[PDB]
Amino acid sequence: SNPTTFSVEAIAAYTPVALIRLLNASGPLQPGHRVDIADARSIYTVGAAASAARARANHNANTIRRTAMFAETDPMTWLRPTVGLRRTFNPRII
Amino acid sequence: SNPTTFSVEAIAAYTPVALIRLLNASGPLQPGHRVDIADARSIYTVGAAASAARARANHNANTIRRTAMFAETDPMTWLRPTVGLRRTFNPRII
Amino acid sequence: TLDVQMGRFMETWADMMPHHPHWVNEHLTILQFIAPSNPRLRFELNPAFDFFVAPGDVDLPGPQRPPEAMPTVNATLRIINGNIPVPLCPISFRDCRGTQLGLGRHTMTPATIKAVKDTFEDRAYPTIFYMLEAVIHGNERNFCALLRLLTQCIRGYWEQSHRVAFVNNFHMLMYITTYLGNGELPEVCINIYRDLLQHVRALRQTITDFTIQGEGHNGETSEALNNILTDDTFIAPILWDCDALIYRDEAARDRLPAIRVSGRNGYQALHFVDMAGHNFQRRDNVLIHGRPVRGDTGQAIPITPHHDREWGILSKIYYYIVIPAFSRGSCCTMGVRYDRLYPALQAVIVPEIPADEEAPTTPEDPRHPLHAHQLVPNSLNVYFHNAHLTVDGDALLTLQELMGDMAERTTAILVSSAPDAGAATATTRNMRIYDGALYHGLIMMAYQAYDETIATGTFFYPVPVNPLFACPEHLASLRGMTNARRVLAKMVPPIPPFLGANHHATIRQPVAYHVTHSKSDFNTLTYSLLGGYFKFTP
Amino acid sequence: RLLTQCIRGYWEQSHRVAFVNNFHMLMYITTYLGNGELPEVCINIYRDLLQHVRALRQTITDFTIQGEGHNGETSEALNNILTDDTFIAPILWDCDAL
Amino acid sequence: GDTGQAIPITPHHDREWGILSKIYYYIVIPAFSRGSCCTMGVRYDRLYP
Amino acid sequence: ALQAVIVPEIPADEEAPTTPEDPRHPLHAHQLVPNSLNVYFHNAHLTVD
């Protein structure tokens, strides 16, 4: 995060981008500066996806861990069959 | 506000007029005096619109700031699309 | 990237035709067609062949600019018997034959007919369904990852307008019938989906009924030698996975195939593209197959089809009978703009619910995701609120783990083959059939032009490949459309020449005219279209 | 909000349809307030009126023959009047028709 | 776009809007009203206050 | 496959749970472990005590 420093948009920019619910793209821009720009777009998309996935962080005390989803090995599979959970319930745990 | 002084109707009269929910037009008149009168009326309606927009003043503690309402720039438009809101929600915050 | 190609076609086509084409005038009656003033009369000699004028000394497919040469008369094979022109084979005869075919077979109850007809003529259909159908892209893993969100979305769309969602593409009603059919959805919706699927299987059983088994020549089964919807050489108008191409390439094997995927011949079929290596502006011929679940992706692992061969037949039957019988020439096939769709899906404002607290359900509390206090502009909550649908926090959070599997971009696939072994003499092998398809393409039911909450052409751009899916009104979504191009495409169905031409394709203009100018019924229209799709091979 | 409340209040008290004289009202109701703000019966009525209008337009374009235009006039405008651009609506709200 | 002062006037909607408006006003309105409706102007100076 | 039942223990002088919303229900998500009979019953969306 430092020293990078922070996203002014600016087409340099930095890869994380670990913000939550950002009112920064709009926001001012205002507008973008006079840079050649090619990506920009791809690195912003990867950084936003990584920022959201890290921005989960919590809600895993509310999980209810993930499952095998469908029926597949599960490398034991010689003394009981395998069945996955259809994810239709409410993962809340209270 | 002062000194002009107050609206007795009177056709001179003054442009603000910064009241709200006035029981003054009717009210007495009673009737109007001996003035040639042509406007009056236009200054009255712009003063009334100003005296309503100013008489909002509050109710902005429950805004919920206004949006673009349509899909227009928004001077970036190169790293995400732009979508406006349809104003059908109930803005009160509470 | 299929935008520049469509723009070049629309620029060249504004002055390519100086007169009315002779193959679109199918509204002639028999007395006017027969009369000697008709210039098309002298080119109708053999009932199994179409005759036209063609450029000489050109090897199809040629370059983008058509080379200058003297015109010569070429011929092609009328594969279907529904390609016989409408003055020679009328609409009333086709509808009576369809009534004859559907004597005791399965019919659709009027409830699902009314609901599907309502959702096909809906102009306020929410675009969030199109974005969801584009980003799931027909993978079973993504659909079962999004089960709660799709259940809440379908329920919210059903018990507010009494219409049926996700009906445009075929890889949704299988997944709804198989997975969301045990009681997650209400009783009427699953009955509607099951009735649509029952009608599709009844059409397939009718195909099997009117053929004779045990007669297979050169690795072609008898139904594929009789019908077209059971022919594995012919492919669906839109594709979501590379299984149909594998079945077509292994099925024909003697009728000389040639498939062109955005440049050089052949496909690469590399699956499991994720966030690290997406490369939206890819100029290669790499197609995204998706993740098979029971196995490993790897790199040296050979590709396998997801589903059985019956899935391709049912998809062809659905897209070629049920969709044009309901839409009646109003739906159009288009690709998607993934480089604008994917950044718009990364904005979710699911709040921070503290521990030992209940998750809010109603949207009247400030902690709900679709409460107005967290209804920030330019997000996905505004997309869901414009559609007036209620979803929870976790239903919006499931897209994050949808994002591990993604699609790069849409592309246009032009396959070609010789006619089948039944009608392949020494002179019909030079005649070839050219038909097009859209990899990772979408179909919208009806087009809205006056919905200004989303700017036009933001996600979808019209690239139509069928006479059935001709869209004279969807072309306003394309950038740079004039009134001259609109009135030019109103009378002639705009098909780009890099996706096949009308006279060289399998599905031609007369079956489209039959599906767009018949007013009989909805069951008898489907059975009449099925009686249309029978080969004229001896 | 105000128009939704007004239409709902006029609907579920006398079962009648509001804002039906103006043509630039039912298009805006169908396009914007058609996703579920209004009850399930009203939006069906507005969609039915718009669908009947478009069916009349398709009937107009069915009985003409395209591809025969003279002096930069379309064949539908040369055959009919409701597709003729010279003829104008009785009520104008915008200057685009002129 | 913007309002401006020197920007020339563009149409709000496409050509099909005029055709549908003419079809509505000249067919659907007189079929339902049966010659009872009447076009009138408005008095904006007595309506806006 | 029929050996695995994940019914929890209910304390004495307490009412048995009926709705599947409480954590004490066998078909609640807390007592929905993979590869047991409870996921077989939950796949069919069937409620049992």
Short mmCIF file of C-alpha atoms in Angstrom, two decimals, chain C residues 153-533:
data_model
loop_
_atom_site.label_atom_id
_atom_site.label_comp_id
_atom_site.label_asym_id
_atom_site.label_seq_id
_atom_site.Cartn_x
_atom_site.Cartn_y
_atom_site.Cartn_z
CA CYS C 153 -34.36 -14.22 -9.16
CA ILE C 154 -36.80 -16.58 -10.91
CA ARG C 155 -39.23 -16.45 -7.97
CA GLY C 156 -39.10 -12.65 -7.85
CA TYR C 157 -39.68 -12.39 -11.58
CA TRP C 158 -42.51 -14.93 -11.45
CA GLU C 159 -44.70 -13.69 -8.63
CA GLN C 160 -44.67 -10.08 -9.80
CA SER C 161 -45.54 -10.39 -13.51
CA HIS C 162 -46.56 -14.08 -14.02
CA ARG C 163 -43.93 -14.62 -16.71
CA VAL C 164 -41.20 -17.20 -17.22
CA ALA C 165 -37.52 -16.25 -17.16
CA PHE C 166 -34.35 -17.75 -18.69
CA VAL C 167 -36.29 -19.24 -21.59
CA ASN C 168 -34.24 -17.81 -24.48
CA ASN C 169 -31.23 -20.12 -24.27
CA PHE C 170 -31.42 -23.90 -24.11
CA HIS C 171 -28.85 -24.52 -21.36
CA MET C 172 -31.13 -23.09 -18.68
CA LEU C 173 -34.34 -25.11 -18.84
CA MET C 174 -32.40 -28.39 -18.58
CA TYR C 175 -30.64 -27.01 -15.51
CA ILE C 176 -33.89 -25.70 -14.03
CA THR C 177 -35.76 -28.95 -14.71
CA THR C 178 -33.00 -31.22 -13.36
CA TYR C 179 -31.92 -29.18 -10.32
CA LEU C 180 -34.60 -26.64 -9.35
CA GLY C 181 -37.47 -29.04 -9.91
CA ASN C 182 -37.87 -30.71 -6.53
CA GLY C 183 -39.71 -27.83 -4.86
CA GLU C 184 -37.37 -24.84 -4.73
CA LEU C 185 -39.45 -23.06 -7.36
CA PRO C 186 -43.24 -22.71 -7.06
CA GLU C 187 -45.56 -25.34 -8.49
CA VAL C 188 -46.58 -23.50 -11.67
CA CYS C 189 -43.08 -22.58 -12.88
CA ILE C 190 -41.62 -26.09 -12.82
CA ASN C 191 -44.80 -27.34 -14.50
CA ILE C 192 -44.25 -24.78 -17.29
CA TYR C 193 -40.60 -25.78 -17.75
CA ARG C 194 -41.46 -29.49 -17.62
CA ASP C 195 -44.18 -28.97 -20.22
CA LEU C 196 -41.75 -27.21 -22.57
CA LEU C 197 -39.26 -30.05 -22.14
CA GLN C 198 -42.00 -32.65 -22.66
CA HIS C 199 -42.99 -30.94 -25.92
CA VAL C 200 -39.36 -30.98 -27.10
CA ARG C 201 -39.05 -34.70 -26.34
CA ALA C 202 -42.39 -35.31 -28.08
CA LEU C 203 -41.02 -33.62 -31.21
CA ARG C 204 -37.94 -35.85 -31.03
CA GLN C 205 -40.12 -38.94 -30.64
CA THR C 206 -42.15 -37.80 -33.66
CA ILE C 207 -38.89 -37.57 -35.65
CA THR C 208 -38.00 -41.13 -34.60
CA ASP C 209 -41.57 -42.29 -35.40
CA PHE C 210 -41.55 -41.23 -39.07
CA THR C 211 -38.21 -42.86 -39.96
CA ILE C 212 -37.12 -46.47 -40.48
CA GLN C 213 -34.25 -47.74 -38.35
CA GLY C 214 -31.53 -50.21 -39.25
CA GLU C 215 -30.49 -48.47 -42.49
CA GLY C 216 -27.18 -46.75 -41.86
CA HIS C 217 -24.80 -45.87 -44.68
CA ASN C 218 -21.16 -44.80 -44.13
CA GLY C 219 -21.40 -44.10 -40.41
CA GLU C 220 -24.59 -42.04 -40.68
CA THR C 221 -27.60 -43.14 -38.66
CA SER C 222 -31.00 -43.42 -40.31
CA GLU C 223 -32.59 -40.44 -38.55
CA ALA C 224 -29.69 -38.23 -39.62
CA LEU C 225 -30.18 -39.52 -43.16
CA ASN C 226 -33.90 -38.65 -42.95
CA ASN C 227 -34.18 -35.58 -40.71
CA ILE C 228 -31.97 -32.53 -40.20
CA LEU C 229 -32.53 -31.88 -36.49
CA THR C 230 -31.00 -35.31 -35.80
CA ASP C 231 -28.09 -34.70 -38.19
CA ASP C 232 -24.88 -34.16 -36.25
CA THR C 233 -23.27 -32.23 -39.12
CA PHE C 234 -25.75 -29.39 -38.65
CA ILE C 235 -25.12 -27.32 -35.52
CA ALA C 236 -27.09 -25.00 -33.26
CA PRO C 237 -27.29 -21.25 -34.03
CA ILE C 238 -25.46 -20.47 -30.77
CA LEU C 239 -22.92 -22.62 -28.95
CA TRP C 240 -21.83 -22.62 -25.32
CA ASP C 241 -19.37 -25.53 -25.30
CA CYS C 242 -17.25 -27.32 -27.89
CA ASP C 243 -19.11 -30.65 -27.67
CA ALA C 244 -21.21 -30.06 -30.80
CA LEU C 245 -18.09 -29.34 -32.85
CA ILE C 246 -16.51 -32.59 -31.59
CA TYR C 247 -19.63 -34.60 -32.47
CA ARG C 248 -19.81 -32.96 -35.91
CA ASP C 249 -16.11 -33.55 -36.62
CA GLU C 250 -16.28 -37.21 -35.57
CA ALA C 251 -19.72 -37.82 -37.12
CA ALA C 252 -19.26 -36.83 -40.76
CA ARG C 253 -15.65 -38.02 -41.33
CA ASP C 254 -16.04 -38.50 -45.10
CA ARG C 255 -18.06 -35.48 -46.22
CA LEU C 256 -15.11 -33.05 -46.41
CA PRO C 257 -15.36 -30.64 -43.46
CA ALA C 258 -13.90 -27.17 -43.07
CA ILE C 259 -14.44 -24.95 -40.03
CA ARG C 260 -13.22 -21.34 -39.89
CA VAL C 261 -12.99 -19.74 -36.44
CA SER C 262 -11.97 -16.07 -36.82
CA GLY C 263 -9.21 -16.46 -39.37
CA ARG C 264 -7.31 -19.70 -39.83
CA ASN C 265 -9.05 -23.07 -39.99
CA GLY C 266 -9.61 -25.27 -36.97
CA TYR C 267 -10.20 -24.64 -33.28
CA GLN C 268 -7.85 -25.03 -30.31
CA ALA C 269 -10.34 -25.61 -27.45
CA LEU C 270 -8.43 -24.52 -24.34
CA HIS C 271 -10.56 -24.59 -21.20
CA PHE C 272 -10.32 -23.09 -17.69
CA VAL C 273 -9.45 -19.45 -18.29
CA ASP C 274 -9.43 -17.53 -14.99
CA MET C 275 -8.62 -14.04 -13.66
CA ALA C 276 -4.85 -14.39 -14.18
CA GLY C 277 -4.92 -15.08 -17.92
CA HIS C 278 -8.22 -13.83 -19.33
CA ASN C 279 -6.94 -11.71 -22.28
CA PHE C 280 -10.24 -10.26 -23.50
CA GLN C 281 -8.71 -8.91 -26.73
CA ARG C 282 -7.55 -12.31 -27.98
CA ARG C 283 -7.10 -12.57 -31.75
CA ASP C 284 -6.47 -16.33 -31.77
CA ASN C 285 -8.86 -19.21 -32.51
CA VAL C 286 -8.88 -20.46 -28.91
CA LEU C 287 -12.36 -21.46 -27.72
CA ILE C 288 -13.36 -21.74 -24.06
CA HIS C 289 -14.85 -25.16 -23.36
CA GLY C 290 -15.53 -24.63 -19.66
CA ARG C 291 -14.64 -26.85 -16.73
CA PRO C 292 -15.76 -30.48 -16.74
CA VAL C 293 -16.47 -31.42 -13.14
CA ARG C 294 -15.80 -35.17 -12.90
CA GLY C 295 -12.14 -35.02 -13.76
CA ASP C 296 -9.21 -32.62 -13.95
CA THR C 297 -8.67 -29.67 -16.27
CA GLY C 298 -4.88 -29.81 -16.69
CA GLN C 299 -3.06 -28.84 -19.85
CA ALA C 300 -2.14 -32.14 -21.54
CA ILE C 301 -5.52 -33.73 -20.74
CA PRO C 302 -7.55 -34.25 -23.95
CA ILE C 303 -10.94 -32.59 -24.22
CA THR C 304 -14.17 -34.55 -23.67
CA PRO C 305 -17.78 -33.52 -24.34
CA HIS C 306 -19.84 -32.61 -21.30
CA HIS C 307 -23.15 -34.11 -22.37
CA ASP C 308 -24.61 -36.92 -24.45
CA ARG C 309 -25.37 -36.77 -28.17
CA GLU C 310 -29.08 -36.42 -27.36
CA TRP C 311 -28.42 -32.97 -25.87
CA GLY C 312 -27.35 -31.64 -29.27
CA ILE C 313 -30.48 -33.01 -30.94
CA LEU C 314 -32.74 -31.52 -28.27
CA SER C 315 -30.94 -28.16 -28.49
CA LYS C 316 -31.34 -28.10 -32.27
CA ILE C 317 -35.03 -29.01 -31.94
CA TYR C 318 -35.57 -26.28 -29.33
CA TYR C 319 -33.73 -23.48 -31.16
CA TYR C 320 -35.13 -24.40 -34.57
CA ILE C 321 -38.76 -25.10 -33.69
CA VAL C 322 -39.84 -23.75 -30.31
CA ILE C 323 -38.02 -20.39 -30.39
CA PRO C 324 -39.25 -19.31 -33.87
CA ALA C 325 -42.77 -20.61 -33.19
CA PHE C 326 -43.05 -18.36 -30.13
CA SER C 327 -41.00 -15.32 -31.15
CA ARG C 328 -42.18 -15.38 -34.81
CA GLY C 329 -39.16 -13.73 -36.37
CA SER C 330 -38.65 -11.09 -33.68
CA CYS C 331 -35.77 -12.57 -31.68
CA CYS C 332 -32.20 -11.94 -32.83
CA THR C 333 -28.89 -13.62 -32.04
CA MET C 334 -26.15 -11.32 -30.77
CA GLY C 335 -22.77 -11.62 -29.14
CA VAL C 336 -21.71 -9.94 -25.92
CA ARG C 337 -19.15 -7.32 -24.91
CA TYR C 338 -17.33 -9.09 -22.09
CA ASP C 339 -14.77 -6.31 -21.53
CA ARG C 340 -17.65 -4.07 -20.41
CA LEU C 341 -19.78 -6.78 -18.79
CA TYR C 342 -17.09 -8.09 -16.43
CA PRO C 343 -16.04 -4.77 -14.79
CA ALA C 344 -19.73 -4.01 -14.23
CA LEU C 345 -20.13 -7.28 -12.30
CA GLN C 346 -17.34 -6.51 -9.80
CA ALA C 347 -19.31 -3.88 -7.85
CA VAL C 348 -21.30 -5.47 -5.01
CA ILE C 349 -22.24 -3.48 -1.91
CA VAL C 350 -23.16 -6.38 0.38
CA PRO C 351 -22.78 -4.79 3.84
CA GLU C 352 -20.99 -5.99 6.98
CA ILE C 353 -23.47 -7.93 9.12
CA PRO C 354 -22.08 -8.30 12.67
CA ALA C 355 -21.83 -11.62 14.46
CA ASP C 356 -24.69 -12.98 16.61
CA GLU C 357 -27.17 -11.07 14.44
CA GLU C 358 -29.84 -12.11 11.95
CA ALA C 359 -29.44 -11.59 8.22
CA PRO C 360 -32.04 -9.08 6.97
CA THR C 361 -34.59 -10.35 4.46
CA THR C 362 -37.04 -7.53 3.76
CA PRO C 363 -35.65 -4.48 1.90
CA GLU C 364 -37.27 -2.02 4.33
CA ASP C 365 -34.39 -2.12 6.85
CA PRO C 366 -31.13 -0.15 6.38
CA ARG C 367 -29.02 -3.33 6.56
CA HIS C 368 -30.49 -4.89 3.40
CA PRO C 369 -28.32 -4.84 0.24
CA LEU C 370 -31.14 -3.27 -1.80
CA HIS C 371 -32.02 -0.62 0.75
CA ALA C 372 -31.71 2.88 -0.69
CA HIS C 373 -28.89 3.83 1.70
CA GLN C 374 -26.57 1.35 -0.05
CA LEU C 375 -28.07 1.95 -3.51
CA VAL C 376 -24.96 3.69 -4.84
CA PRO C 377 -24.93 4.61 -8.56
CA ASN C 378 -22.90 2.50 -11.03
CA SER C 379 -23.02 -0.80 -9.15
CA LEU C 380 -24.89 -4.08 -9.46
CA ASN C 381 -27.44 -3.17 -6.78
CA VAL C 382 -28.79 -0.52 -9.16
CA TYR C 383 -29.09 -3.25 -11.83
CA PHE C 384 -31.11 -5.44 -9.49
CA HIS C 385 -33.20 -2.53 -8.20
CA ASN C 386 -34.09 -1.40 -11.73
CA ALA C 387 -35.53 -4.87 -12.31
CA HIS C 388 -37.38 -4.63 -8.94
CA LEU C 389 -36.09 -7.99 -7.70
CA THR C 390 -35.17 -8.93 -4.13
CA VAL C 391 -31.90 -10.75 -3.44
CA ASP C 392 -29.89 -11.34 -0.28
CA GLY C 393 -26.25 -10.70 0.54
CA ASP C 394 -24.97 -14.22 -0.09
CA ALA C 395 -26.89 -14.43 -3.38
CA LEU C 396 -24.89 -11.41 -4.52
CA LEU C 397 -21.71 -12.85 -3.00
CA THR C 398 -21.88 -16.07 -5.06
CA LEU C 399 -20.75 -14.18 -8.19
CA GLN C 400 -17.28 -13.80 -6.64
CA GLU C 401 -16.80 -17.57 -6.82
CA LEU C 402 -18.55 -17.60 -10.17
CA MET C 403 -15.68 -15.37 -11.34
CA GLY C 404 -13.08 -18.17 -11.17
CA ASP C 405 -14.48 -19.58 -14.43
CA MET C 406 -15.10 -17.07 -17.20
CA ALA C 407 -15.46 -16.63 -20.95
CA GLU C 408 -13.16 -14.41 -22.99
CA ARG C 409 -15.19 -13.17 -25.97
CA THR C 410 -17.70 -14.24 -28.59
CA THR C 411 -16.67 -15.31 -32.08
CA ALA C 412 -18.27 -16.32 -35.36
CA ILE C 413 -17.91 -19.93 -36.50
CA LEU C 414 -18.53 -20.87 -40.14
CA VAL C 415 -18.57 -24.62 -40.73
CA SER C 416 -18.99 -26.28 -44.11
CA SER C 417 -19.46 -29.78 -45.48
CA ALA C 418 -20.46 -31.78 -48.53
CA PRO C 419 -24.01 -33.19 -48.74
CA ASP C 420 -24.67 -36.48 -46.98
CA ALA C 421 -24.02 -39.94 -48.39
CA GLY C 422 -27.63 -40.40 -49.49
CA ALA C 423 -27.49 -37.58 -52.06
CA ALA C 424 -23.76 -37.44 -52.87
CA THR C 425 -23.32 -38.20 -56.56
CA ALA C 426 -20.30 -37.28 -58.67
CA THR C 427 -21.52 -33.70 -59.26
CA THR C 428 -23.03 -32.78 -55.88
CA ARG C 429 -19.69 -33.10 -54.08
CA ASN C 430 -18.60 -29.78 -55.58
CA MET C 431 -21.74 -28.21 -54.11
CA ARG C 432 -21.15 -27.36 -50.46
CA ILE C 433 -23.39 -26.05 -47.69
CA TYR C 434 -22.18 -23.10 -45.62
CA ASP C 435 -23.90 -22.22 -42.35
CA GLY C 436 -22.81 -20.04 -39.47
CA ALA C 437 -22.91 -20.12 -35.69
CA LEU C 438 -22.10 -17.84 -32.77
CA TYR C 439 -19.80 -19.12 -30.05
CA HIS C 440 -20.88 -17.65 -26.67
CA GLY C 441 -23.75 -15.75 -28.28
CA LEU C 442 -27.06 -14.64 -26.81
CA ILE C 443 -30.65 -14.30 -28.03
CA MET C 444 -33.00 -11.60 -26.78
CA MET C 445 -36.74 -12.10 -27.19
CA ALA C 446 -37.83 -8.55 -28.02
CA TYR C 447 -35.88 -5.32 -28.39
CA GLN C 448 -36.58 -2.10 -26.49
CA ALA C 449 -35.35 1.18 -27.96
CA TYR C 450 -36.80 3.70 -25.50
CA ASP C 451 -35.36 2.29 -22.26
CA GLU C 452 -32.72 4.92 -21.51
CA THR C 453 -31.60 3.66 -18.11
CA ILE C 454 -28.89 1.77 -20.02
CA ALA C 455 -27.24 3.30 -23.09
CA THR C 456 -27.80 1.39 -26.32
CA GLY C 457 -25.11 -1.01 -27.47
CA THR C 458 -23.40 -1.09 -24.07
CA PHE C 459 -23.24 -4.89 -23.78
CA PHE C 460 -24.75 -6.47 -26.90
CA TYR C 461 -24.29 -5.80 -30.60
CA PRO C 462 -26.49 -7.41 -33.28
CA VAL C 463 -24.77 -10.07 -35.37
CA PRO C 464 -27.59 -12.16 -36.87
CA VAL C 465 -26.96 -15.55 -38.52
CA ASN C 466 -30.25 -17.13 -39.68
CA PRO C 467 -33.18 -16.11 -41.86
CA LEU C 468 -35.24 -17.27 -38.86
CA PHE C 469 -33.43 -14.94 -36.43
CA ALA C 470 -33.47 -11.91 -38.72
CA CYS C 471 -33.81 -8.75 -36.64
CA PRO C 472 -34.81 -5.66 -38.64
CA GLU C 473 -35.43 -3.71 -35.42
CA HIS C 474 -32.50 -4.90 -33.27
CA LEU C 475 -29.97 -3.19 -35.56
CA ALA C 476 -30.38 0.15 -33.78
CA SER C 477 -28.16 -1.26 -31.02
CA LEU C 478 -25.26 -1.26 -33.49
CA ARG C 479 -23.07 1.84 -33.39
CA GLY C 480 -23.57 4.19 -36.32
CA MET C 481 -26.97 3.22 -37.73
CA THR C 482 -28.73 5.48 -40.23
CA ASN C 483 -32.30 5.49 -41.49
CA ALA C 484 -31.18 4.35 -44.95
CA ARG C 485 -29.63 1.20 -43.47
CA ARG C 486 -32.79 0.58 -41.42
CA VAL C 487 -35.11 0.82 -44.42
CA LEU C 488 -32.62 -1.27 -46.41
CA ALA C 489 -32.63 -4.04 -43.79
CA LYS C 490 -36.39 -3.90 -43.24
CA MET C 491 -37.04 -5.64 -46.58
CA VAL C 492 -33.92 -7.86 -46.83
CA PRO C 493 -32.72 -9.95 -43.85
CA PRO C 494 -29.19 -8.69 -43.13
CA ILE C 495 -26.85 -11.67 -42.95
CA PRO C 496 -23.09 -11.05 -43.13
CA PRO C 497 -21.26 -13.00 -45.83
CA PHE C 498 -18.68 -14.29 -43.35
CA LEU C 499 -21.47 -16.29 -41.67
CA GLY C 500 -22.93 -17.91 -44.79
CA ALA C 501 -25.31 -16.73 -47.48
CA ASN C 502 -28.98 -17.56 -47.98
CA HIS C 503 -28.64 -19.68 -51.11
CA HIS C 504 -25.71 -21.69 -49.69
CA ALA C 505 -27.15 -22.30 -46.22
CA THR C 506 -29.37 -25.09 -44.96
CA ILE C 507 -32.14 -23.03 -43.36
CA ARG C 508 -33.32 -20.70 -46.11
CA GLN C 509 -35.80 -17.87 -46.66
CA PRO C 510 -39.07 -19.86 -47.26
CA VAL C 511 -39.09 -21.58 -43.85
CA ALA C 512 -38.52 -18.16 -42.26
CA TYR C 513 -41.42 -16.78 -44.31
CA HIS C 514 -43.57 -19.68 -43.13
CA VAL C 515 -42.67 -19.05 -39.50
CA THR C 516 -43.29 -15.30 -39.76
CA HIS C 517 -46.45 -15.17 -41.92
CA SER C 518 -48.55 -18.01 -40.46
CA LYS C 519 -51.37 -17.43 -37.98
CA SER C 520 -52.73 -20.87 -37.09
CA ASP C 521 -51.79 -22.00 -33.55
CA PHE C 522 -48.74 -22.73 -31.42
CA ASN C 523 -48.82 -26.54 -31.28
CA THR C 524 -49.70 -26.94 -34.96
CA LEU C 525 -47.05 -24.38 -35.89
CA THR C 526 -44.41 -26.49 -34.11
CA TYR C 527 -45.58 -29.70 -35.77
CA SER C 528 -45.75 -27.94 -39.15
CA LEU C 529 -42.18 -26.72 -38.68
CA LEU C 530 -41.15 -30.27 -37.81
CA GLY C 531 -42.84 -31.53 -40.95
CA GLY C 532 -40.86 -28.84 -42.72
CA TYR C 533 -37.48 -30.15 -41.55
#
